[PDB]
Design a protein around this ligand. Sequence first.
Ligand SMILES: Cc1ccc(-c2cc(C(=O)O)c3nc(CN4CCOCC4)[nH]c3c2)c(Cl)c1
Ligand SMILES: [Zn+2]
Length: 351
Amino acid sequence: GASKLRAVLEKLKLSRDDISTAAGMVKGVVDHLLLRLKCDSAFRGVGLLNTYEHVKISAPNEFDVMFKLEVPRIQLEEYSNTRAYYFVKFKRNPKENPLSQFLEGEILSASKMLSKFRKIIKEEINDIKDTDVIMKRSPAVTLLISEKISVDITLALESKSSWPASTQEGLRIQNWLSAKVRKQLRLKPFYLVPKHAKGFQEETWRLSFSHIEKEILNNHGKSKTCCENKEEKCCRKDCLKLMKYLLEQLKERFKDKKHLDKFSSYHVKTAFFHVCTQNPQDSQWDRKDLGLCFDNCVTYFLQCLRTEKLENYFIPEFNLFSSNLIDKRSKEFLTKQIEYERNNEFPVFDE
Ligand SMILES: Cc1ccc(-c2cc(C(=O)O)c3nc(CN4CCOCC4)[nH]c3c2)c(Cl)c1
Ligand SMILES: [Zn+2]
């Protein structure tokens, strides 16, 4: 029942200290690069984005880090009705921006900016000889510290402006976290990561709302006091940790023929939060009900792959499971693998 799952989560608690020692290795290298970039003309307004504060975790030895660049008076042009991919233009010309180095008429190049960013890092990488830091061959700068810790660095354009139109019906937390909280969150800035649409269109930026996850996860209840006492203990966080570790273990047992390469913890998060919308009450996430609650996430995720539909939590018109992003075969393969786990009381957790 719920007994087996608790031991898995209690096991995952034991590796917190090993992740904490490796976390300081990430922040050390990252702070040197931030000092190096600030001395440059274009990367003077570079800062660390808090998404472990500024260090986000995707896999056990993978660490996603985000560098933000303040872009004032930014005008966005939507690309090919994709709803998430956009072009970066400038409202007017009051006093020429320092970002003009990568401009191409009106449109700001994503390929040109990421290239100078890759160059300034490649130069600073060989400088700090304290730890073995390298660079790998994908809109991120991957580093490898002590031939084990992989750090995916991403550059993002910050816009303090009102969120784009495609996000109008997104973040459907009204019946869960409230209309008050939705309005509050939508007052926060948004990000433009250089993810390119399928060759590629290397001048299009993707809408990123990564920074909102910590806001919702650290305040996940309908009741303001959720998980603040022994009475209101819920299992929302435990179901997300079990959903993340499920895909993680399936990506480990099937690196045999590389079918699940397109799948990330991101797809698992999106699906979990959609269940959080479906189940807005705290009584639908009780600590005793861990087994039942996890199965609700497992059923929704299986229904997602099966229907080839998983809406971006912020952009409903954007389908993360479209034929264009992940092929029909990879979804039908993952459907079959999870279906086997669900029908056999999850044998990929027995360790
Ligand atoms: C309630 C809530 C809040 C935030 C997110 C959320 C959003 C984004 C996003 O960007 O909108 C994102 N992005 C990541 C990691 N990226 C995967 C693709 O490659 C680059 C790294 N996790 C992400 C997580 C979700 Cl689901 C739900
Ligand atoms: Zn809770």
